[PDB]
Amino acid sequence: NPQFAGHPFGTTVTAETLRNTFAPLTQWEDKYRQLIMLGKQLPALPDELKAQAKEIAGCENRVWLGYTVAENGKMHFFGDSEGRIVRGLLAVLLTAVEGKTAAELQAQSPLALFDELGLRAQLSASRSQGLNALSEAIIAAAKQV
Amino acid sequence: GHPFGTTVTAETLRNTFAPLTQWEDKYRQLIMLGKQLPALPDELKAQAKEIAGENRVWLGYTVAENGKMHFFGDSEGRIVRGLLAVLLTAVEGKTAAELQAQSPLALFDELGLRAQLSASRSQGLNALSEAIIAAAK
Amino acid sequence: VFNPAQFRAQFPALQDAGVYLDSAATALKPEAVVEATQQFYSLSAGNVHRSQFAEAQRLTARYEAAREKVAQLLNAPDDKTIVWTRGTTESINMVAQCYARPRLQPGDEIIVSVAEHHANLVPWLMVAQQTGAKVVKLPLNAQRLPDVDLLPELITPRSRILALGQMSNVTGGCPDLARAITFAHSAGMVVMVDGAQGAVHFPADVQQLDIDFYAFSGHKLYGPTGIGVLYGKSELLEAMSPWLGGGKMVHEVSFDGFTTQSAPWKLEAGTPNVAGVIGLSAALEWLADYDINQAESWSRSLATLAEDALAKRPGFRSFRCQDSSLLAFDFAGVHHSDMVTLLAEYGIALRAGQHCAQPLLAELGVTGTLRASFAPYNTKSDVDALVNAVDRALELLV
Amino acid sequence: VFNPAQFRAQFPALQDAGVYLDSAATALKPEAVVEATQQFYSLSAGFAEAQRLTARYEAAREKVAQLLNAPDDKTIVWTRGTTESINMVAQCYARPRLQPGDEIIVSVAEHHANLVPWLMVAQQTGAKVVKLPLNAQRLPDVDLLPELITPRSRILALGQMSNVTGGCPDLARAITFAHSAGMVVMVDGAQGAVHFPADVQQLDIDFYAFSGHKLYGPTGIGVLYGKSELLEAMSPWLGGGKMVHEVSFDGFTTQSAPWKLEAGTPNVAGVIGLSAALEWLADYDINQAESWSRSLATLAEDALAKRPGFRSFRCQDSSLLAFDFAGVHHSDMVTLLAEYGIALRAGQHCAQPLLAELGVTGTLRASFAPYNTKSDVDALVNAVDRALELLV
């Protein structure tokens, strides 16, 4: 059951974990501060490991997203970001989709956890190119299975 | 060979044009005028600078020993043909110096023809004028 | 139902007198396009907005939806098959240079209709000269249309490309495109469809017609100048070489070489004509509320009122095909340039000359034509004005 | 005498824009441009607005000629931007002339528009791109050219001014060395035309390129200036209407330049609006406006240099200020700054080799223009201090 480019999101860091962290936060600046903290739990992905994920490029910031199906028949997602803010957004996203089947991922509305945590309308980073591409790549991946 | 500058002059044109105040009469009279520019045969359209614009126009010259310039040319379109007649009346027999001295389009101002000249700028007249300038150089 | 007065009222250029009958050269613009442009140039394109929050969002939304609105017009299967160009002309040159040029062998053949606009002929002459291939003429049938039934005679094992206008800018005529495509695909050829007029009047369903490449210009489609589209099947856009080199189309670059984006971005180097994409998006969004079949019937009905009356004047000759909204014509012994000038003086804007279709007008036996082209902002009053202005011009050119 | 408040007042976007410091990517537009455009797309079907637009359009190449001190309006070619201009030179002038083993010298400071076309034509012809590196002041090392130039050197491609460092190389010398070896020079003026518009006659430039949208002007419109003999030598670019004289199924003949190089319906709106930009701009002394923009950039650079971990890549007290902060990713800073009300740019700025040379994978860039103010500098410094507190 170890996975390629392992991360805690969806297993040890849960939607419940995140709701507890984020629900008390009403100031936009503190939301960015906690995104930055959260992204520290996503391990750095060495150059050699990036080349097995899809580069979801953009002007300002490189983000990687890759996936596979685990021995339990559930999708496993992995990735990295250079910017620390987008790394936190990536962790939120990994929390939403890790260990879901293709079917469950087609059932889920894009970025719903971000609305739940008060992140989507409130932070412009949430509505930026980087995160919308990431969202699209999950959809693409769920279809491709 | 054409009457313009010899049989037809700035003065003869003024008697025709200066009294006109209706734009349609002006056009009517331009079109009348160009009837009197002979049809340039193939043999000496060859000896002219051809211009394709909507309308096709031609402009050739000869220079006397004196430097008096004889201009020839033609236009498919009859209204440009007319304007070409005015232009030829302004420039026929002029020297390169007299040509660089005058404003070649004074004559159009003088006959109340600026709007008609204006309207046909794009299809011959700009180009005809510029080949007037270039011949004097 | 289509309401002409409703359509006409959206054009500020028509608020005060003038009869405009040159839409086949360029179309008037609806308020939506004028206002979208004004907004784009009056607001920062950056990510900060402190006072015009909703107006910034709408500009972003027009820009982001633009490819999709073109995909919707053409029934393309997805918005990544839409590439931005300067115009139909750039679109066709890109296909010649980036698809055809690396694939053409000496003696290969490119069939080009004799009714092609220069945009869909010159790039084929150019690429033919570069590869040793040859341009082959597809002549006109009886009805003055490209003779699609002649294709089996013209197609050989060396035939590679068919370049064919969906709709002529002179006659308004549309060849049987579905049948030309079926013959071309039987031989493994690819088809470049010039839709600069067809996209306006009868926008092509590129899936139903199985069109390989389709090109059109924004400015004839009630939109900005400086913007056009190339549609290509995804496999063909993928096969294409990159077009211009520079930012946006590259992925990585060093002094050792470069890699590119996939299409469409691979083919779109440098800063986009962002005003043009936004204005075109706004044109298409605006036009989407009208039934095009009805608006076109309206425009053709006017061209028929005009042609019927004009045919009662001696010496009239029409080149019009299929009751088109385009009416090209002449008068025996009257020069088209004299007529256009006088009509302009009478307040009718038409076009005269060669219409970038020299081979067509040579096949027709003429040197130039007048052309009146109608659009859904035109009226019956426009028709009476044109006819009267022709009468007055004729009395003067008698 | 330059009045910033007078210049600033002409820019309708400014109230909504907040603090706009990304003019080097694209410039805000003055009323003249907005209004000329509005007028063109609204113009009464079928006489005073009409004639004004006609004069804007017919005078447009001449207004460009006056900016550049070109000998005449027929050395000005319309394109869709600097990018198409450079590709045209590469394809229409260079490609028919280059032989295998010929060399094209390209500075490491070049924007991708003045580098990728050269890679491409090199690959097509068997020519080789040869790198012109930077000197110790971060400028293309013009003094090294004699050593880089060989009997195979045919083309020098060099930016008048970098969109990163704002740095301008010694272009007069560079061109004198290139011409001595019988080379032609492609000058990328996309920034220079905005800040120090080039005297193309004095500098003896072979080809010069710039974009309207950076010169306070429309998108989708740019210039290629070339010496008349080089424009005449160029092969046609795109084929189609307008560039052609006669056409048949046997072949075609072309207009001469500049029309030879301009197939199809022009970007009429873009020409008219760039004409209005240039006419409006001609009422300002460009040296004085540029000294103002530079003085703000300096005020910002000195303030930020007081914060720990600051580094600047700025050359020659440029109006462009590229910079980074130790341990802070440029993406995170650009995002927070935008939330604070400051618009600037981050990333690689289409200059990946330059950034590789400088040892970084991205930078922030704040670029100042004559509509920026001292408060804009205060606001930027305020937002940076608030951002750095969140990020370090």
Ligand SMILES: *Cc1c(COP(=O)(O)O)cnc(C)c1O
């Ligand atoms: C922006 C820029 C270009 C590219 O101009 P476009 O308008 O995108 O074609 C080229 N060179 C420099 C230095 C630039 O800043």
Ligand SMILES: *Cc1c(COP(=O)(O)O)cnc(C)c1O
């Ligand atoms: C207008 C037109 C073109 C050319 O489009 P541009 O916008 O000038 O590039 C090509 N083909 C036909 C049929 C046209 O009407």
